[PDB]
């Protein structure tokens, strides 16, 4: 039976936490997967990570240069929400440098992009089989959302670019049913910038909060419908929520427009809550560290800045990177809405630390009825490793 | 289908070996994760083994410090009875620096504490995901049982304390139904102190034997109703179960108050059986070394001191620790009654032994129609290990 | 549904390899038990081997002194048949250092034995929970087959033995039902020895084949009714099976006696085809080196000499060991009859070797209708291990 | 149910990345079989890699000399498509130093080649047990395909060899129902070598594309029919794709008789599309580096050498060597034709590389409607590892 999906996102005053895999300091003993761009997505029966390896592991000497974004040795495999990305629990899923993945209700879709950079390949993947492809429309890196797609009543969303990550790309809208495309559309956004999206769904319609590499330092948003009509703009928030960015006294914020005039970024995410916005990210206004999430009073609809709750999850004496947004089915959850959950990659060597690998463990929250303290779910793994002597 | 759970707890003679995990044995060379706290619960298909582990493995410099007890890093995990808490074999189940689990007869919840100590956060899982939470209502290490929580015809119950560990603290009953809490107790104990209760299904309720760490050298009793009235008190016997403890000649024993006059403890536990009493104990009074159980004759109603049945499972030349409760599912069994079976943790490294770690295995029994000869199931381990070195 | 198991063996003119796990040679790297005494036996669904582990490690310092039989760490444990006693892949069967096991067709029961040399317990698990007990009868080593039990139509059959190794003990003959103790019988055998018995069903009947370990060198014979009467003698051949034992020439043979006059001995296992016997033994006469297979004809109701089949499965270079019997059930096979295989367990170490450790793998074999050539599919690892540098 | 497979091959424009184990890579740490020869094969709810262990593991002693083929010690074993073949996931399927492996919609068969040169024995596997066997025939290495057999509504059949490497030998068609042999034939051949055949099904027929490794540098095809009747003859394509092989500009084509004058070679597979063919091959004409396939126009039916597609997969500066074929279950892919798919092994160690061992790791591809860019998914592993030193 497939997921519905039709429901609203669950208003949360807080999150607690689901799960914190361990996978570094797991790995400094332990047979892991030396990885990256981590993410959660649930099929009506579990949550599972999801994770680029780089076909290498922690503390072995092939662990070497995996700073490195992409590679023909980079694969998508899986382990249960939790559980570290160790081999022998681990299933393969697509050959990959960028990834997403989501359940239908039926079976487990996957998208793993590879090849090379000027002519990359994306093999759709449903049921653990090849079944479509997107080859390369721009010839320039090809590349995904690193975090769930979404699926509503059997239809699965899921936002790609191709093009420069510094100017004007090109992003696109796909629709599969049962691991074959069945629908497309180019995203007009002349000005604006789009990468590794994190969706969810919310009232039947696909909500996106995404990475401006360009020029912004506030998030892009992007609201698809089933028809693939869509609404794009950014986070109306008068409150930068991208890295780099400026201090919160100085951004006015738009609702239609990049602000803050910055290069680079990092994956992040937003929950829309009626009128209001979820927005997560680092401390840090330059580095990726620390991680908090501000509920946004009027956020989602207007430039506000009126902060109502802050969470701490990650503090700033500690590493960060990406996050990304997910949901609970209904029939794990046991809820009439949607209950909105994140995950927040913690990354650990390269380049900020003193080692010759760069890999990243994870953090998993979710939404609940409650107000949830500050702390820190640091990767706490002690770095250098053996194999960086 | 729901477990019913309202049967009679079995008259048992003597305990037979349920298993042995042999976990720091196997960790000096395989991929085990250091723990403590494990403990036993049973569903209608299997008995896993719980653990908090240390985010950390045997033999490995991140277990360095593991002491101690509370970490971000810490989780709540399991694997099947009698398989060591490895990497490989292990289901993630939540962030936890206490925990409590139990299963209805239709899935799994568990109880995770996390968070700072003054702010500590309790996360219910069911089904492998969030459903409800506990905020600490004292702000002083909101904490729970280490060992299986207790469900009856659906409906799930376990005890949890907020406040000192050395003075009059708060205690708490809660219930829940699929995950999700609905109704909960204040327990009123003034003069006494409830820690770590092993809890136990008979007659349709919920008996707990727990353990006072503030004055009582006797445990605390508490028998819970579905409606979540209860009585409490203390273990009758005029046998001192708790350790440290003072000599048993020295010991007059009651119904209602603490007595011995000394601090700390040791989780333990105690199976009624009619209105006799199975007690487990440490052999040294001092010490966490040794395991013994003895039958005290009326022992549950009175302050009796005749003890007519005493095995041995762990000598006093060997390390235990925890001890604690839990009953075979009608299901497996096939008895018209609950099979009572308890687990013992040996405790390895600090603050005893020559190492910068500490973990601990298991060894598990259950009660059976005849009597069994004493011996010692030791965890066997040869310390230090090479990490030591 | 329960195995019927009333069916014929099937008549066979070899045997085909059917597994082989390199548990030792995997083990100089991997993570393997240190075991011995494996075995075979089969549910509906799949065969498994199961094994006493010594609750350590290859190559780790805890596998020193595993040449010895009993201690408290030893512990049964099963994979799936072909596969190494590896810790990440091993179900937890029992604690034991002597077992058995068969399925009924329903579920696994198992029986493993521990506790004290002079009042052992065997426990018997069904369904992967303690059911029942079997307390030491004669207070000197509680022991068991070391093999495949024996499920006829829902109740399961096994021999075990208490009392002097090198003298005159005692034997029973265990019946259960789901896990539950429904009868049992003292043998009768003033002369003759039972240990360790290799048995299989056919036409109704339990035949085993087992060790004397008192004076003879030929096979006791064992023919249990599933009422609990039985026929018991030795295995009518003139030709001995045991290790060590004297030459053929020199050997007469009888139905009802020991011959040979010798001690120790060494598992080993007979199917029964029609009045034939297939016999198996150690290719040495003295040490267990080696292995092969004899057809005598009416070896099994008369002191006959002529083989009319042979077939090696070790040569005589090579380190052999115990060998047991079991059968593949019908609803694996397709057949209309009983197949008979059996398992070799090949010893590496001491006493034989430049070791401070005792291991074993297996090979095993299942008869076909047809002739197979000799060949050795032997142990391979080379010693000594880095753990004995 | 009965995988039907009487459907077309599926017309396909190019191959997507299915998946890659990285096996070698991940086994410079993990722990990780020693093989060669791997393959992929089909049920209707996953596929799965096959390959044959040399019953030890990379970076251990025991993975000395294994450049060697046939050793007591190999064993046929399976995981996961795209999982390395560790020992913790892997299934054991036979004992084998030659092998196929094919689903027939309701179980597994295997066939594994074990035994003494000259008196080989094949044992049929069907759900997990022995089921029946082939003994040499020719008494001079019986062997078989080393990729997926082919099972078309509930029979399967594989082509087997048995004699010379060099010269005229015998080989043989075999038919299996539920893992017991139905039927046999002899191929008529004289002049003509037939090695290692990659097969599929095809409009109700078996399809197979082989390796002379006698005289020819094109390869033998034949065309098996259920009721046992074949043509056979070789790849009629004026493009050579043995190895090693000649210039295709002095190649001329046949599609009956051997051409190229060279011994020696290596597996291969072809798709027939119509009467085109899709035929692989390494990039090097002397040596196992590179890998690439060529769509040749007409390339079934005559001697054409006219190249309509052409893509890489391995790239010249890298080792390839065996590839071969299987398809898609429609109940998997969801087509009205069978999706044709590939494996390249891809070989390290010896004779090429400064090692004392040998092994490989595998990529697999999948036809689809789309042209695929070259690209090379080579192994990556960093030679020579540590037990080299
Ligand atoms: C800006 C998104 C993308 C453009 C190619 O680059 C990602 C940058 C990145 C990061 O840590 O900021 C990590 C990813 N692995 C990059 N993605 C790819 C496909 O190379
Ligand atoms: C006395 C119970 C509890 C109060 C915070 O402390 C436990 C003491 C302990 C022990 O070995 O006696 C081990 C536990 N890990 C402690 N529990 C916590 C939640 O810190
Ligand atoms: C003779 C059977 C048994 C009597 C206690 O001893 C077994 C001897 C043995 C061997 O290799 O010959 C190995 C077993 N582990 C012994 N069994 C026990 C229960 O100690
Ligand atoms: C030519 C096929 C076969 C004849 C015995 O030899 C195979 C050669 C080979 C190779 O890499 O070319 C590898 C295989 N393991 C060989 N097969 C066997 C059964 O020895
Ligand atoms: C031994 C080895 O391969 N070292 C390389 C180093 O030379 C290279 O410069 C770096 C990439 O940046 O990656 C390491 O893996
Ligand atoms: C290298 C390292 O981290 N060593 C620390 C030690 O300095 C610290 O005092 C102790 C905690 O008590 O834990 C060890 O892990
Ligand atoms: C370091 C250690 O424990 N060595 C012991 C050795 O002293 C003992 O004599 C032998 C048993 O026979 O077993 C080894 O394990
Ligand atoms: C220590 C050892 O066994 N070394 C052997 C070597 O002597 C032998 O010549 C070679 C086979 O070719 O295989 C290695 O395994
Ligand atoms: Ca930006
Ligand atoms: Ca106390
Ligand atoms: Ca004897
Ligand atoms: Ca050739």
Redesign the interface.
């Known amino acids: 039976t497939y997921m519905n999906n039709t429901e609203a996102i669950c208003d949360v005053k807080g999150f607690?936490?689901?799960?914190?895999?361990?996978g570094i300091?797991?790995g400094?003993?332990?047979?892991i997967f030396v990885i990256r761009e981590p993410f959660v997505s649930?099929s009506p029966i579990?949550?599972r990570t999801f994770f680029l390896?780089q076909?290498?592991?922690l503390?072995?000497?092939?662990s070497n240069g995996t700073v490195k974004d992409r590679?023909?040795?980079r694969?998508l495999?899986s382990v249960?929400?939790?559980?570290?990305p160790?081999?022998?629990?681990?299933?393969?899923?697509?050959?990959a440098w960028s990834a997403t993945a989501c359940h239908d209700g039926k079976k487990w879709m996957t998208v793993g992009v590879?090849?090379?950079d000027?002519?990359?390949?994306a093999?759709i993947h449903?049921?653990?089989?090849?079944?479509?492809?997107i080859?390369?429309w721009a010839g320039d890196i090809l590349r995904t959302q690193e975090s769930s797609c979404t699926c509503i009543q059997g239809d699965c969303y899921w936002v790609m670019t191709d093009g420069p990550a510094n100017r004007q790309a090109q992003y696109r809208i796909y629709k599969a049913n049962?691991?074959?495309i069945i629908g497309q559309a180019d995203i007009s956004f002349n000005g604006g910038h789009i990468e590794e999206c994190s969706c969810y769904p919310n009232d039947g319609k696909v909500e996106c909060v995404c990475r401006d590499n360009w020029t912004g330092t506030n998030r892009p948003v992007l609201v698809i419908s089933p028809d693939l009509s869509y609404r794009v703009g950014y986070l109306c928030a008068g409150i930068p929520s991208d890295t780099p960015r400026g201090e919160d006294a100085q951004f006015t914020g738009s609702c239609t427009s990049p602000m803050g005039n910055q290069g680079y970024g990092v994956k992040g995410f937003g929950f829309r809550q009626g009128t209001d916005v979820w927005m997560g990210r680092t401390i840090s206004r330059t580095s990726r560290s620390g991680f908090e999430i501000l509920r946004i009073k009027n956020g989602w609809t207007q430039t506000s800045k009126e902060q109502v709750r802050k969470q701490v999850v990650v503090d700033n004496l500690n590493w960060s990177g990406y996050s990304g947004s997910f949901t609970?089915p209904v029939e794990?959850?046991?809820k009439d809405c949607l209950?909105p959950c994140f995950w927040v990659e913690m990354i650990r060597g390269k380049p900020e630390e003193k080692t010759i690998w760069t890999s990243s463990s994870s953090?998993v929250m979710?939404g609940?009825?409650?107000?949830?303290?500050?702390?820190?779910?640091?990767d706490?793994?002690?770095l250098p490793f053996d194999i960086d002597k």
Chains 1, 2, 3, 4 share one sequence.
């Not at 607690?16 to 361990?22: E, I, Q, V």
């Not at 249960?80 to 570290?84: D, E, F, R, T």
């Not at 160790?86 to 050959?95: C, D, G, P, S, W």
């Open positions: 607690a936490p689901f799960s914190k895999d361990n300091r797991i400094s003993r332990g047979h649930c579990e949550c390896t076909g290498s592991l503390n072995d000497k092939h590679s023909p040795f694969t495999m249960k929400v939790g559980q570290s160790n081999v022998y629990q681990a299933r393969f899923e697509a050959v590879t090849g090379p000027s002519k990359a390949v093999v449903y049921g653990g089989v090849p079944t479509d492809v080859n390369s049962q691991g074959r609970l794990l959850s046991g209950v953090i979710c609940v009825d409650y107000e949830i303290a500050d702390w820190s779910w640091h706490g793994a002690i």
